[PDB]
Design a protein. Sequence first.
Lengths: 649, 649
Amino acid sequence: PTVVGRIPVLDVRPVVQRGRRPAKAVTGESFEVSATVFREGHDAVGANVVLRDPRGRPGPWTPMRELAPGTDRWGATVTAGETGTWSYTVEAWGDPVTTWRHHARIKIPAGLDTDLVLEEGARLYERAAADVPGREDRRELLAAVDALRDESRPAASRLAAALTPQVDAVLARHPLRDLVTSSDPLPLLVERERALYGAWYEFFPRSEGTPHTPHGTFRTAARRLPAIAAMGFDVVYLPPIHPIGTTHRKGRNNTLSATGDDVGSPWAIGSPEGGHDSIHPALGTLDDFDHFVTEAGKLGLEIALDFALQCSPDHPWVHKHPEWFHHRPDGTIAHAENPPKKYQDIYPIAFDADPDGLATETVRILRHWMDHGVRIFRVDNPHTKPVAFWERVIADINGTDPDVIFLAEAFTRPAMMATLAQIGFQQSYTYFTWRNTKQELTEYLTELSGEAASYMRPNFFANTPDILHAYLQHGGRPAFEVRAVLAATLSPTWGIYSGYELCENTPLREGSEEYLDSEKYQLKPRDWTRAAREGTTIAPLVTRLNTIRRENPALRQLRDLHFHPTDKEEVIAYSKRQGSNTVLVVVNLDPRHTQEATVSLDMPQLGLDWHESVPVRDELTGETYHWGRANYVRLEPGRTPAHVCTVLR
Amino acid sequence: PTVVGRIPVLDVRPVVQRGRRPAKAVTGESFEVSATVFREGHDAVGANVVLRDPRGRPGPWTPMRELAPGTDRWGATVTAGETGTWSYTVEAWGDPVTTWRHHARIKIPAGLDTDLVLEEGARLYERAAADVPGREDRRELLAAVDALRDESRPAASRLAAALTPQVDAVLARHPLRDLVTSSDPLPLLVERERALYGAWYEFFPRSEGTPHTPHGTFRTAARRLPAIAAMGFDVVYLPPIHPIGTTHRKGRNNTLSATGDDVGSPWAIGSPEGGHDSIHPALGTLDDFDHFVTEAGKLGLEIALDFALQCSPDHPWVHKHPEWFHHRPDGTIAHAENPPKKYQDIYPIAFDADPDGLATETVRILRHWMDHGVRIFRVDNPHTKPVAFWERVIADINGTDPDVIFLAEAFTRPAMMATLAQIGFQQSYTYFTWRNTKQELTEYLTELSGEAASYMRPNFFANTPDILHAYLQHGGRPAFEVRAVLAATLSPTWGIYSGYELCENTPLREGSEEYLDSEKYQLKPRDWTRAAREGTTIAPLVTRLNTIRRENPALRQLRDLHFHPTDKEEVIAYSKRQGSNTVLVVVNLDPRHTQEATVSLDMPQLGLDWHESVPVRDELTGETYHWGRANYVRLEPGRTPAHVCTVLR
Ligand SMILES: OC[C@H]1N[C@H](CO)[C@@H](O[C@H]2O[C@H](CO)[C@@H](O)[C@H](O)[C@H]2O)[C@@H]1O
Ligand SMILES: OC[C@H]1N[C@H](CO)[C@@H](O[C@H]2O[C@H](CO)[C@@H](O)[C@H](O)[C@H]2O)[C@@H]1O
């Protein structure tokens, strides 16, 4: 048996790890299936994509087209439906009718063997009709056959009868396919909308306390939820909610020794009060948590818990499962590290003595929180645990609970970042915060929206508690407005960490991406009411961006994204499209100086002619404009970061 | 089970059609095996390639290195041995000694728990020692262990004893490998030297006749062979040697009607005198052919026969196996075409009524010629026959006779050309004749010497009976010298069609790549004795190039090729290396004007640092130079087309 079929179909894409891991999509997401297809000789080929759902039912007739002349690369868009494991194949075939038409349209007007040519056509349309299931449709073709064979009409008339729009339509839906050859099926994992699309908000419950009780509880923290929902977020991500170790607890500003009532780092998990399946006592009880989750749920907010597979020296695991740690010759366990960062308050897990016990316990813990309504987990530093461990854990959980979403916080090298997504992580943190110039953004988003979109779904946090980028530090509020627009419009999932709205941008020191007085090591109460009254919050802009996202399907997908050229280095322009919805964004990346630019739109990329001019509405202001192949923009930092326009019909 | 192992090993290359076809090499050929290798956490990894021969026997320890900082892409060079089907895997592992050494070199000078660190080292070296086979190497490690543990000594001395060259050498041979993880085996097809390396000469036996008998026989054509061997060729490629059809036989200069004794095209195979398993009666008998093959063998020449799977209308198959042809409704068979070329003298084969019958007869025919010493077939237009037909035919023949070499004459789109190589064609014709500027040559050869070399072996014919490129038409003798040097030094396999050495360069008409009075349609007697006497032949240049090739392993491989910058667009420079053999070539692509240029060698690519100066000898003249990072050259058409230098020892 041969590797290549009768009509060659090769290199079907997308493909992940040569077909051993599934490509990814979510419900309603479109993406391109492509292949290299050609045949021997000079005649025509056709091709089509067969997408099969988890029960094996094929989707609609989905013909492909050659994507560029002379390349033999064919593609078609398919759209993912219900969640589950799908498969797709590419079918290739000889296309004799197209070939016959090409020749017939030439030889008949030249009077060359017209009777032979027309009879050959009749025979083709007959074979075509044989496979047409609808009775009026076969009759349409047989009428063409009979007209083709009618020697009493002029040849040109005989041919025209085979080329009518009604014949074309039957053949469009039921073409005559010679020597149909199929690729081997490739797997597709379709997951729920939220895996691709959502707005995230991170905050520390303990910071939302009272004058009398500064350490917030789930009961008090629940008060922030309406404000978070009102800003248009969908997911609330909480730092670890478990007891915190006392041994080597870190003090304020990441100092080595905690003093007094210092609350320590939430990531330093575990004490006699309990481990990863328990609640920090100052946060309250499990019932309080349930209350928080229920209240979050009523406002359209899902909870994402941090899962940080590591232990303070006081975690129960240290004595219950010593073999889950690497011990030095004197029995001590070296603290964890992420060079040059040091985590003196914690132990790393060792995986090679009892990998099974660790997997069993990990999925037990996850299922515990899942039983209490948590269907999303933000996994802390997954790249310092074995890759196959996450592969196994995620497969175990999604096997029983496929809706659970895992988000990889892996700020590391590209191979590891990609592999984690490929072995099952639904979402990935990305290099976004370190992409701030037009070139960086353009290059990086081209990567994320390109081939990588086949296994990775990016979550654009404009800040995190560990990342206050120099761009925000130097740019102030105008920089925050810019990054929110970018994050919100370039990825269907974005997030901010509480305080971003207030443009908090004081670094620990010059050259650091840490916050001064970081919330990681201390309660950080915020005057939300005053900022609202004094207009010193960009919460309304954040709110508008999420509203715009909620109203424009184009911003709820990733793969359709195109950058349009501008004549200023500081001004970036791009469009995203989903069906009839087109959003075009123009952003001034300069947070300090007004920039004027001409934006030259790739009109055909927008589905338009070059001379054409179209109505747009700037969704940030309500202004209406008419934009064409060359558009003037003037963006003044502080007054306006960007135009976020929808194309009006 | 997980798809990823304990230590990730991903995307092993070379790979062809995701592992469904073998990558290729020939005996003695080196190539790079690469993989993506990394681990969780921050500790070091190591990797190595395990290349296994047809009996499953592993090669030597072949450690890999990271190819570029931060990429996690690792590679090592391997070398193919005996012919057959090999396999290769990549092994990845934790490298605890490298990890420990890095930390120990830092922690010991710092005074940070040095006893603990040294004891950790002792335990490692004990582990390392346990696997070590050598009586003396193990005691070397165990001595380092004792020195590490000697608490009566200074920390620095204790550490230093673990870092001696003696210890480095032991661990370099027998490293301690943690958590060894293997990729899945990939197939490697190793074939005989001639598949990659050889010089080809195409000529028509019928043209080598006599005054008294103009149409050559195999006995007269054998007298041309000594001159051919003397030019340093290894392979003689003969156009089809079968009876030639009379129906619709073509006349001189590709005219529609043969007249008188026009001999017709050899590619119009078949008459009642016989088909593809027969000899043209004017060429003689099978005994005469056997004599011809024997004479070829005495001179070190292999015969390559043209295999053209097509028929004149007089071929016995036409009526014996009508279903091997596509018939029009009036019963006629349309002549073959290669648009805009027309082949009115032949019918193309149809493959889908009796594919088994066709495959069976094809391999019967090939095996017939194989039994008479033909171990190479030049396959005419394989791309108008099914790709899977060739995969089947080649698999059948090489299954019993793995030494047989198939050369694909497919001048077509890249996908088909590549696919034919991948499904089994040992060699491919290329775009070489249409690559004549420095940029064209540079780009094209970068492609051929890169990833494609894992599946395609190029045969650079500077001309064919169908291709007289304008460069040769316009440039005369100096252009022939140039393309000969280029062809001979850029590919380990190259060729010419007889008359090339006489600088035959008269086109059929301007703008054509056909020869006037093409040998395809008439006897083309050439006065070889006179041309040699009068010095109107570049046979001596051809002879020198093949001698240089026979003497320099660098010119007998493909993948090591580097282009070096020059300051004149018309002057190209490149190097090839194999072991200690380095060849440096500089060619003046201008056939009409003397060119002076500076050649700036990338000295590290030659294995030299930038200030070094090296002796070279131009093997075309015997002149010796001293060349360094910047070298003056002056190349004069008709006198010095190029420098072909070997680096002297
Ligand atoms: O997603 C980033 C988070 N993943 C790190 C390790 O768990 C977190 O480190 C924090 O938590 C650590 C342990 O509690 C402290 O040692 C660090 O100083 C502190 O920054 C960090 O916030
Ligand atoms: O390697 C290219 C060769 N593959 C073509 C088809 O067999 C060859 O065509 C030749 O042979 C044909 C059939 O005899 C003629 O009709 C053509 O005019 C003649 O050029 C051509 O030499």
